[PDB]
CSV table of C-alpha atoms in Angstrom, one decimal:
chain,number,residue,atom,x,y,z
A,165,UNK,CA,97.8,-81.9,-18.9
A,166,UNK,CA,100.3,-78.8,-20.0
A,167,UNK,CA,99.4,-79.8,-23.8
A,168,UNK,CA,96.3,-77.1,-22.9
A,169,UNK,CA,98.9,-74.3,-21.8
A,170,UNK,CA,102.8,-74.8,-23.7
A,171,UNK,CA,103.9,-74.0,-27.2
A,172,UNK,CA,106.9,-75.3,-29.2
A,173,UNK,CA,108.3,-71.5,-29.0
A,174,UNK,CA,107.9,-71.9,-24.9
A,175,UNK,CA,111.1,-74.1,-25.0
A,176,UNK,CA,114.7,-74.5,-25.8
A,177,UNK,CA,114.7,-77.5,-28.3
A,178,UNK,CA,117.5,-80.1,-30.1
A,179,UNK,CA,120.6,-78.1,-28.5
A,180,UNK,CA,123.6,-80.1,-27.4
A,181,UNK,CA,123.9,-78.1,-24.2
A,182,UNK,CA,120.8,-76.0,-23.1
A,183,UNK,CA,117.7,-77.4,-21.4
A,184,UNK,CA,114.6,-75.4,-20.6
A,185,UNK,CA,112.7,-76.8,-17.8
A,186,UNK,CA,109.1,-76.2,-16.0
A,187,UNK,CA,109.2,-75.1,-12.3
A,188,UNK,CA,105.9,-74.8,-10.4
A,189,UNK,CA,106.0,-72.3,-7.3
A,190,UNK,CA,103.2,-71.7,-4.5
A,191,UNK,CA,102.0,-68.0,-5.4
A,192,UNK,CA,103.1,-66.3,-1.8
A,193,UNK,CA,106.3,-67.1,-2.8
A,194,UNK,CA,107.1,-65.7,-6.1
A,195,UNK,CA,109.2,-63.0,-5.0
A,196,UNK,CA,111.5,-65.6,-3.5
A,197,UNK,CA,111.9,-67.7,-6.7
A,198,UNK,CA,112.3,-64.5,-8.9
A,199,UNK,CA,115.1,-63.6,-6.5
A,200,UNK,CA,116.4,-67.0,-6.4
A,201,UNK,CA,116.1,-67.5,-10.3
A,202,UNK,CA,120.0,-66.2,-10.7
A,203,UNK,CA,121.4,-68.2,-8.1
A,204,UNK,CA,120.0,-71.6,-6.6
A,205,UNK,CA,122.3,-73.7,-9.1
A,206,UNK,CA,125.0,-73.0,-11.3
A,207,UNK,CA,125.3,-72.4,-15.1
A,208,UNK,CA,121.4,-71.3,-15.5
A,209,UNK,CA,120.6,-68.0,-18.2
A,210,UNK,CA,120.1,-65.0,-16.1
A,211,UNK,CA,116.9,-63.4,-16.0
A,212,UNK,CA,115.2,-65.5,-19.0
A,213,UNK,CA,112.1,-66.7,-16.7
A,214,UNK,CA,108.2,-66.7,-18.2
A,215,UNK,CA,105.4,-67.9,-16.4
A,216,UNK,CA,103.2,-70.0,-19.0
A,217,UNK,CA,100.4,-70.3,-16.3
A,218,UNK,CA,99.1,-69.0,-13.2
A,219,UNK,CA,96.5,-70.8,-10.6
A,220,UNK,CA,94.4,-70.2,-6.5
A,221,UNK,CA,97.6,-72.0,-4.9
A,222,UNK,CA,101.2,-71.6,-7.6
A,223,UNK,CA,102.1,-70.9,-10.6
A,224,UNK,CA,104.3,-72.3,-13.1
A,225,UNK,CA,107.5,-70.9,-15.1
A,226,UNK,CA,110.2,-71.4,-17.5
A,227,UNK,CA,114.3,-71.5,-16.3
A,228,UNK,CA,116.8,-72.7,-18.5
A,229,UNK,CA,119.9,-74.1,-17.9
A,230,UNK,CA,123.5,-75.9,-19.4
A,231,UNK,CA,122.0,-79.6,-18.8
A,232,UNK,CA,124.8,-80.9,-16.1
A,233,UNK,CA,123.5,-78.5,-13.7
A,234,UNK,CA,119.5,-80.2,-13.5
A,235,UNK,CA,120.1,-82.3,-10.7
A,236,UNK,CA,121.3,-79.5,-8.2
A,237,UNK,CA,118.9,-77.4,-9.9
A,238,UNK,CA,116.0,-79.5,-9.1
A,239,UNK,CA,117.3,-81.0,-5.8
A,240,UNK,CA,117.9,-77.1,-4.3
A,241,UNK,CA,114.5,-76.0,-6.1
A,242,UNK,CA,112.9,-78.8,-3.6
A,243,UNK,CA,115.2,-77.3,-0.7
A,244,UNK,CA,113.3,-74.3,-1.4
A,245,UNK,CA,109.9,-76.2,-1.8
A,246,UNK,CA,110.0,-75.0,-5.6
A,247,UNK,CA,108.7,-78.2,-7.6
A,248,UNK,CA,110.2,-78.4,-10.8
A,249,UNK,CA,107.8,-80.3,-13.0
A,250,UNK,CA,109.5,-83.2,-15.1
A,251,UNK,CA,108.1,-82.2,-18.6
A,252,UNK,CA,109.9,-82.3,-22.3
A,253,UNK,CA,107.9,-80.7,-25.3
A,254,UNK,CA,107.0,-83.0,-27.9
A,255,UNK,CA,104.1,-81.4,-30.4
A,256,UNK,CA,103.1,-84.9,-31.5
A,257,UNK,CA,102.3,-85.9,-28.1
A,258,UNK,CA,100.3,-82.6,-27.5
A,259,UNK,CA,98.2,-83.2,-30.9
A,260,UNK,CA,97.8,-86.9,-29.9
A,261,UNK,CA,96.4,-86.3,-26.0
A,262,UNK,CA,94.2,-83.3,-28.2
A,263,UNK,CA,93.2,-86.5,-30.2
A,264,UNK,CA,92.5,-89.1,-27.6
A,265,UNK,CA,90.0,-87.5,-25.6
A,266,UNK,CA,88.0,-87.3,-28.8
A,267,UNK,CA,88.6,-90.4,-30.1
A,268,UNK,CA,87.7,-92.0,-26.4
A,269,UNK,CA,84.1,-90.0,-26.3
A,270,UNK,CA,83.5,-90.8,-30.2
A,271,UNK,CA,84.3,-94.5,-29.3
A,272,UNK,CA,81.9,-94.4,-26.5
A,273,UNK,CA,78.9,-93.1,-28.3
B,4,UNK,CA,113.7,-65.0,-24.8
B,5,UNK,CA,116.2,-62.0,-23.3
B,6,UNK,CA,118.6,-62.5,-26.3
B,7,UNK,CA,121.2,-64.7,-24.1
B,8,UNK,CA,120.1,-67.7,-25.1
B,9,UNK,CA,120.8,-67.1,-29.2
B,10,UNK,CA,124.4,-66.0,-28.1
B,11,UNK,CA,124.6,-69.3,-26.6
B,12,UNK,CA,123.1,-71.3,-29.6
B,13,UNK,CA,125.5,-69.2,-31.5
B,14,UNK,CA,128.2,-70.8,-29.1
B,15,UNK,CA,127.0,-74.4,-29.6
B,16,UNK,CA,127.1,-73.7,-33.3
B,17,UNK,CA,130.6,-72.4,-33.3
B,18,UNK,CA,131.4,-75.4,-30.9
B,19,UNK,CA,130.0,-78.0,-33.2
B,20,UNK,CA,131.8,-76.4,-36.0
B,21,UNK,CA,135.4,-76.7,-34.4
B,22,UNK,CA,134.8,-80.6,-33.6
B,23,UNK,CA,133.6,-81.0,-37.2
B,24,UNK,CA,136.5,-79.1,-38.5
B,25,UNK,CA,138.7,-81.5,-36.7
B,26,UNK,CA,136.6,-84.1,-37.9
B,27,UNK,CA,137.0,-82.9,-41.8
B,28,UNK,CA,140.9,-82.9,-40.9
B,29,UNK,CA,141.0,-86.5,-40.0
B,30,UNK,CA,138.8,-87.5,-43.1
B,31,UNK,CA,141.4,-85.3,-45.2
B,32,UNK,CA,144.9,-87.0,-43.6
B,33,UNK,CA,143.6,-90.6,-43.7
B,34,UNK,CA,143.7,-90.5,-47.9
B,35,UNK,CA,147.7,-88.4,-47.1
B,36,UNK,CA,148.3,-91.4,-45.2
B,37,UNK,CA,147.1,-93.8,-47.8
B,38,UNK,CA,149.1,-91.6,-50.5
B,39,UNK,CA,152.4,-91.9,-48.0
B,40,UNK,CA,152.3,-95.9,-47.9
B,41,UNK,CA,151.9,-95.7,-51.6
B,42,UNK,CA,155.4,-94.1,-52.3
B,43,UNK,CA,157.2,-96.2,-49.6
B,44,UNK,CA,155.5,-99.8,-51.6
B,45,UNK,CA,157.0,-98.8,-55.0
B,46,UNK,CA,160.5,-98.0,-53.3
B,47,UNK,CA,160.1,-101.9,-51.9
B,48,UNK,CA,159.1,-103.1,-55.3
B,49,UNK,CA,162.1,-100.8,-57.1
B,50,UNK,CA,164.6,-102.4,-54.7
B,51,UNK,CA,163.5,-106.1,-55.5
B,52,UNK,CA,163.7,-105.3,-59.2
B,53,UNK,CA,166.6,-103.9,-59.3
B,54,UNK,CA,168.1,-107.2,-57.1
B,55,UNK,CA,166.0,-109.2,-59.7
B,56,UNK,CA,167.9,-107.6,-62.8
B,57,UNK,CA,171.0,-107.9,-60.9
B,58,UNK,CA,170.7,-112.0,-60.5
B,59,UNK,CA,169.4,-112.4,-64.1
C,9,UNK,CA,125.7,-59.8,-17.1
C,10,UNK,CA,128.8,-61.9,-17.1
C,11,UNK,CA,127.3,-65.5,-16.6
C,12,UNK,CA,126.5,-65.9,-20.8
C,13,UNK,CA,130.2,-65.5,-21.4
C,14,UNK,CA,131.0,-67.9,-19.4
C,15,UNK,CA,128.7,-70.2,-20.6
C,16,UNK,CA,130.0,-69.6,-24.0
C,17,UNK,CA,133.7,-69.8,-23.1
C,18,UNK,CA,132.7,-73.0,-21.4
C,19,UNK,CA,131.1,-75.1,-24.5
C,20,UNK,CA,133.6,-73.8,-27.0
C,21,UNK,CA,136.1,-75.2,-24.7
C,22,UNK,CA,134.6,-78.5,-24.9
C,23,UNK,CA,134.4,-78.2,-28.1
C,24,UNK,CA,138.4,-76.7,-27.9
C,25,UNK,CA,139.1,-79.8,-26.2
C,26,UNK,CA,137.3,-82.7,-28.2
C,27,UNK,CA,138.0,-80.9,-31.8
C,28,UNK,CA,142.0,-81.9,-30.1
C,29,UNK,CA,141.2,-85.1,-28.9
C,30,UNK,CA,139.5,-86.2,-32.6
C,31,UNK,CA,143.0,-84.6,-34.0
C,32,UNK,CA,145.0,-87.1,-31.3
C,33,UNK,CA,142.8,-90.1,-32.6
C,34,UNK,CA,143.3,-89.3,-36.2
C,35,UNK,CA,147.1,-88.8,-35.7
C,36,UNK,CA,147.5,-92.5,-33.6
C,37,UNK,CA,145.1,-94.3,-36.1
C,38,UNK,CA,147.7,-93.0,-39.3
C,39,UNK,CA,150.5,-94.3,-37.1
C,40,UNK,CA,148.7,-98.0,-37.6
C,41,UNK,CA,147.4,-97.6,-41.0
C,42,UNK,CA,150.6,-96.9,-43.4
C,43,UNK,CA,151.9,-99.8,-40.4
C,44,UNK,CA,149.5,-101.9,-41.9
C,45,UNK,CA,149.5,-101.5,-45.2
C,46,UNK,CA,153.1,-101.0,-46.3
C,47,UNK,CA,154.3,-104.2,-44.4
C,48,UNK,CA,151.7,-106.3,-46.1
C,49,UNK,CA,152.7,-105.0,-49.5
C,50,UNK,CA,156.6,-105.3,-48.8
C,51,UNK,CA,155.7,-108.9,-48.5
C,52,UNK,CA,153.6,-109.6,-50.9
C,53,UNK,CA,156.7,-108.1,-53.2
C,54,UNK,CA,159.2,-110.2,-51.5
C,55,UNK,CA,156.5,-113.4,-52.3
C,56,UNK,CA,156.5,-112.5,-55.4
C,57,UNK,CA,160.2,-112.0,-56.3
């Protein structure tokens, strides 16, 4: 559940033509993402990565891109067993799962 | 952040802007259209009064 | 580096493009309107006269 890790501010929101989307990479090969990052599909923003969160086996980090390009993006990520996470921010959501779990253990008791 | 992506909102926004401007011309020229049909009606309408007058 | 301009370049062209094609529609929608309503009033005078 990434409602415990992202912020609103994490993202590229509402634009016509930008996405910003979550990859999740095993930690060994970091260096190869970061040097992939400007190049595995076209029409991404150069160097604007941020890893939101860090783990034993991967990590996981922002790219953003023009959205045609998510398909080879994604597609060439998995060529180079980079995962890219399907996510899209929605605060409501992330208050609501925050609520839920809460609601579930009050209804419980 | 690395300042790319505002220049690129910035982009979008002037984007947007253009299509709306052509947008704001079209709502414009539909009412110069309206005002063009207008002056060729009354030319019809002169033309059959004057033919009218001319019978009388 | 480069690639920003590009993508600039890029959407403003879209936008280059559909802001033209808007202007195209508006220009072929005219074409039927005063079509429309000065033949219905050129009738409606010659019905009445």
């Amino acid at each position: 559940s990434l409602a415990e890790i992202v912020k609103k501010d994490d993202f590229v929101l509402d634009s016509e033509y930008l996405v910003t989307l979550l990859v999740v990479v095993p930690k060994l090969n970091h260096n190869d993402w970061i040097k992939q990052y400007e190049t595995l599909a076209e029409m991404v923003v150069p160097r604007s990565s941020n890893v939101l969160s860090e783990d034993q086996d991967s990590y996981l980090c922002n790219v953003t891109l023009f959205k045609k390009a998510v398909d080879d993006f994604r597609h060439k990520a998995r060529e180079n067993k980079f995962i890219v996470r399907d996510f899209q921010y929605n605060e409501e959501e992330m208050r609501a799962d925050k609520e839920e779990m809460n609601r579930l253990s009050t209804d419980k008791k | 952040q690395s300042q790319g992506i505002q220049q690129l909102l910035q982009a979008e926004k002037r984007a947007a802007e253009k299509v709306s401007e052509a947008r704001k011309r079209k709502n414009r020229r539909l009412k110069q259209a309206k005002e063009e049909a207008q002056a060729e009606i009354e030319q019809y309408r002169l033309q059959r009064e004057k033919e009218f007058k001319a019978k009388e | 580096q480069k690639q920003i301009k590009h993508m600039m370049a890029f959407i403003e062209q879209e936008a280059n493009e559909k802001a033209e094609e808007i202007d195209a529609k508006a220009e072929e929608e005219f074409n039927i309107e005063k079509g429309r309503l000065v033949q219905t009033q050129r009738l409606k005078i010659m019905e009445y006269y």
